[model samples]
Target: KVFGRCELAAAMKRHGLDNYRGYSLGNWVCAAKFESNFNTQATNRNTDGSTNYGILQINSRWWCNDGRTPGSRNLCNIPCSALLSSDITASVNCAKKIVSDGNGMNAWVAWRNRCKGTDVQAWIRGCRL
Candidate 1:
């Protein structure tokens, strides 16, 4: 396990994600909880034959290369495996680029469905950042 909510929050803050791209720290925490439960190695295959990788669950169709697909956008320019490592630096950096592209948290479906307009303070209830 990479971390629980509090530790994840602290790490995110340390990574300069506390208020990145206009989204709140609680928003990232809540999205991480619902996306991959803060598990760095998390991977989920979609019915569309695409995969979501890592804590942010970035999509292979756009962000990273899974190597199976031929013409992925691969905007993040990193392999999907990079996102699944215990160290999340690559994933966080790619996520920063993604959010900077004007999508904000809307790039994450988990954020849209579960975190948007929700009371997300509980996501960082005991985090010391």
Candidate 2:
């Protein structure tokens, strides 16, 4: 499922991502936009043979277990397949675990390159949050 900008914003709020781990709601919105364009089923294969799963693009190597990555950590203790759900609850929780585990929003490349050190308000401009 694809999420509209405000729809994505509202979903994140429902997941309690507001200023989670010092990262603002806008930060999450920006990352989601650039990482998956709000696509719930987004996946990207890494050269290391691991795949990033879901809208937030959680990695197989250290997060969800796809049962195929060379050395999956499965730190989130969740099946990678769950990340693709349109509900987004699992992805949001896994993302929370990622940040609380010390990675922070920097775990996302598109976030660092596109959302970092910038005004992310425009990403969710029309959202009532």
Candidate 3:
């Protein structure tokens, strides 16, 4: 509910992005929608009867531990819950990379290009952010 463009942009700024923009928020929204239907509190059921929780669909059981915080993991280069870290800035930075060819989507043009798919990527390449 609080993950809309303005909110997400604000969150990004709060986390440390001085140049946060709507397109970045849009990309994140698109990915989040693709991943978990925009449900911040969503949880996924696992075969082991455990659970992966949160909007980012973070796998808490496997990633987070008693001594650990909510957002933690060892899977993937950035971890499943890396985007949900309590350190909002770190999380935003991580999210930026996921969309920005692995460092985060900061440029609107880059976001448009990558998000556009095959044909669009070619067209987007000529467009400015």
- The TM-score that candidate 2 achieves is 0.96
CA RMSD per model (angstroms):
1.1, 0.9, 8.7
Candidate 3: residue 14 lDDT (0-100) = 59
Candidate 2 residue-wise lDDT, 81-100, digit = tens = 99999999999999999878
lDDT score, residue 100, model 2? Answer: 88
Candidate 3 clash pair list: 40-55, 96-104, 97-103, 97-104, 100-104
Q: Per-residue CA lDDT of candidate 3, range 66-114, in tens?
A: 2233444433344444444444443455444434444344322333444
TM-score of each: 0.94, 0.96, 0.40
- lDDT for model 1: 0.87
> Which has the greatest lDDT?
2
List ranges where model 3 is wrong by over 4 Å: 16-25, 48-50, 66-129
lDDT of 1 by residue, 1-129 (tens): 567788889888888887897788999999988999899988999887889999999989888988876567799999999999877788889989988987788989889999999988778887777
Whole-model lDDT values for every prediction: 0.87, 0.91, 0.43
The CA-based lDDT of model 2 is what? 0.91
Backbone clashes per model, in order?
0, 0, 5
- Model with the higher TM-score, candidate 2 or 3: 2
Candidate 2 clash pair list: none
